């Protein structure tokens, strides 16, 4: 029953860098985190100014 539980496939939703199962996550984390933190940083700069 708990072995019958298979997580569904979110391939419509993932970022294009992490589409395949082969490519790892530790080798491409910093670009994704830096993009989202860049958005938050530009928001913070606009609010502070």
């Amino acid at each position: 029953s708990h072995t019958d539980i298979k997580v569904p496939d979110f391939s419509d939703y993932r970022r294009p860098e992490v589409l395949d199962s082969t490519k790892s996550s530790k080798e491409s984390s910093e670009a994704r985190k830096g993009f989202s933190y860049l958005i938050t940083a530009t928001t913070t700069v606009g609010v502070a100014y």
Binding site: I5, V7, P8, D12, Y13, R14, R15, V18, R32, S36
Partner: protein
């Protein structure tokens, strides 16, 4: 109304959630957003607008009748 924990009672329900750094910001924002907004528009204008076209007719007709009352003189 209180804090978490003692609200409801749920049996077996499984929720999956992906990481936000894992997935894209806007998933297909111009291939599903346009059919969704056209669908939600088509399912509401027939209940919202037929009072407002009556308001538009009242505005135009009242303007025309005030000009009727004043443009003979």
């Amino acid at each position: 109304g209180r804090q978490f924990g003692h609200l409801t009672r749920v049996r077996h329900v499984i929720t999956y959630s992906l990481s936000p750094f894992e997935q894209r910001a806007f998933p297909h924002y111009f291939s599903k957003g346009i059919p969704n907004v056209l669908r939600r528009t088509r399912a509401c204008i027939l209940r919202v607008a037929p009072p407002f076209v009556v308001f538009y007719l009242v505005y135009t007709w009242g303007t025309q009748e005030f000009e009727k009352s004043k443009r003979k003189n």
